[PDB]
Design a protein around this ligand. Sequence first.
Ligand SMILES: [Cu+2]
Ligand SMILES: [Cu+2]
Ligand SMILES: [Cu+2]
Ligand SMILES: [Cu+2]
Ligand SMILES: [Cu+2]
Ligand SMILES: [Cu+2]
Ligand SMILES: [O-]
Ligand SMILES: [O-]
Lengths: 439, 439
Amino acid sequence: GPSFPEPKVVRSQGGLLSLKLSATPTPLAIAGQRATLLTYGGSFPGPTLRVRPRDTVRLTLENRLPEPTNLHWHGLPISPKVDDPFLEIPPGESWTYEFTVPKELAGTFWYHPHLHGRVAPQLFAGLLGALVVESSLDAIPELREAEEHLLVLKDLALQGGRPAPHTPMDWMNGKEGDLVLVNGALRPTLVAQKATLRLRLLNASNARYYRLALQDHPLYLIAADGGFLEEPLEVSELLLAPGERAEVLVRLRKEGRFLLQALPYDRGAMGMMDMGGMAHAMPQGPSRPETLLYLIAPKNPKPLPLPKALSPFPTLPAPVVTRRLVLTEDMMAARFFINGQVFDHRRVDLKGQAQTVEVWEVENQGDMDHPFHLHVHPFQVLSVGGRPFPYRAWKDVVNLKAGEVARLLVPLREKGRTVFHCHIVEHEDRGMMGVLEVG
Amino acid sequence: GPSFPEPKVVRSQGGLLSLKLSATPTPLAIAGQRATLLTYGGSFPGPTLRVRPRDTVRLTLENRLPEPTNLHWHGLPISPKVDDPFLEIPPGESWTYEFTVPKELAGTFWYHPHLHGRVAPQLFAGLLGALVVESSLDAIPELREAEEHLLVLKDLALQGGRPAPHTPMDWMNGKEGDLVLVNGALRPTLVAQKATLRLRLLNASNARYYRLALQDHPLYLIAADGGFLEEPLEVSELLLAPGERAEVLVRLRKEGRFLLQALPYDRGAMGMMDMGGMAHAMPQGPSRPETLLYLIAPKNPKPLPLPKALSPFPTLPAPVVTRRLVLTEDMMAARFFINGQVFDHRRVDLKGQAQTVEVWEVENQGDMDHPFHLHVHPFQVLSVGGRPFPYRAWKDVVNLKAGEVARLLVPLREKGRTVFHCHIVEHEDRGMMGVLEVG
Ligand SMILES: [Cu+2]
Ligand SMILES: [Cu+2]
Ligand SMILES: [Cu+2]
Ligand SMILES: [Cu+2]
Ligand SMILES: [Cu+2]
Ligand SMILES: [Cu+2]
Ligand SMILES: [O-]
Ligand SMILES: [O-]
């Protein structure tokens, strides 16, 4: 096969992407070993769905797992009557998701389970895939002529040829695995054929962070979770928290081998120690550095010029309400809270009005990083930790370190009941989720 | 008696104003004629209650009317568990209102009935009185040395020695009377003994407006409904809508007789005409000019200097929500609406958070003037009809002409359920009222 493994792509045909996908235990070869994972479409990751604005998507999910499941169309500003976080597909049953891709949309999105209390083990076991919305902006020469790849960043741990079970500490921290993979492959080699690469990045891990850095190179950020920036932004490194996506341009500067690494990052995960009358929580500290892939540059690379502009960010109406949502932790209980409460699917927490804009101030009063996700309604990050964001773009997950406040501008789009929650999915399963009703 | 009739004053004693007041049909002499009015304390207007911040008020209202009644402490930022717009005192029964006067408070307030569907006939019949909160600011020489008077502006119509009954047209327009009185007197004479007068003004009429102008003199506005301005504001005339209060300084310029008039004002009241196939609504046009009182200046008047400053207006926290409240009319049905609904005491319309500030945009989409009143939570008028207000002061009624939008800054104070409504009280009785719950 191609030196660089990427998931199989399924494309819309004549404006329709009609596909049946089964969620199923699947024996497969992974990182040189045989394992049974839970997959969509018999692969890990699941197939990449590639569509254009205004396409119709008709996806029938057949549940062949021994427990109920469903889909979250992560990042898609569609109706919560379609992207329904409360729906349950029982074992053996099927459900058809049908929606139209919004006209003003572009970027890398993804799909995975969202059945409360069962997300972490299902996602950890392999149930996820990417969805790419192609844009007319892809036709500009500076992007068209780049070599494009999707990088699904997901780790895994195996025990007896199956995904390792969650421990109590896993429910507290979020589970990370020792196999740190790209597109389900262990440290693949990308042999570049062009000097400019356009990489779509997805963190589909339960809890692992990727502090991304390419040896000897900067990255040029061109898209965030849910759309393009206004112009490329040069960065020395790029942190991708669970659930986040980014698109970058890489401009290969000379021939050679360059490592794309996940540099040490301390997200505040905790261990336990006993030092002669202790038995108390201790920080795990920063992650060990990981090599994600080997990047081989072509001979005499001459990268393209960067595009001067991408997409202008919409001018939003003035906001009509300000909300405050405080995150707290009970680590030893592995319970997690928003405004002092745990999720209750019967309780509406916030009531907003469609087509108005709100300001959400999300404050992390815990000690762990928490990546805050809102369904259905993409937002503009204004500032985090009192620092203004250096670009305008649509996001749907925002990482908060301990103590930090994020100020978000949230246009309310589709009507209905939806949710917001931490995307360390163990924390969501353990209660860190709330309900927004838009009318 | 004194040439200038003013209601009897009852003052707190040792920090307590403890008083029993009966609401009762009372034969009395009024404007040279004998009539039976409904009064508090056997007088029209009822007695003026004069208190200081931190005083305790203990007022037992005995209901001697043939229908239920209650009190609204108009303008007082106290608890809606005390100023309870839903409470009913049945005929023959009593209820004791007990509250502490807030520390940061000054001005002219008033009391009258607020039993939904019965306000207009009860207020029209004579049930109202003033409450004055004395301030340490009263001790400054420029105010202390002024001659002070209360002017209760209230009109009346009599039929068979009793208040004239409401007609259907009265329920549509709000009832106005031909006897245009000051302190229950017909065109009294005020023989000034000092060159500077300090006049506390109260519009306690059901619906009549007072476009106030003193012949040959400006007025110096020093207080609005619920407190002092920051400094005196010179005006050529001053419109007082139903429920509003103001305090002015008058600086008598020369000897002579000067008329205080209610100049012609068109509030959009409607009549009916038939011109050969008609039978449709027609504007009544501006009110006829009224003389309110005769003001006789003393010999060689030398008025005091104006105070340079009054009270600094509080700096308010940034608002956390913006509300829109649209007023509409069904004139021929005499029904009046807020956001398309009529009052329902069981329905909560707005839910806010105590100690936050909200912006309320109130829009009059009708053709009549509507004076919008909010209980419990005094507001700062920012602009009306797109014109910035020329002063900062606490208000609790704001007049909107046809088409106008008022933008108000509303700090939410005491918790509980309260109401907002038009203070053309017929319109409130006919549905133009809503419910705010503060928690
Ligand atoms: Cu997700
Ligand atoms: Cu979390
Ligand atoms: Cu979710
Ligand atoms: Cu009132
Ligand atoms: Cu009205
Ligand atoms: Cu009222
Ligand atoms: O999710
Ligand atoms: O009232």
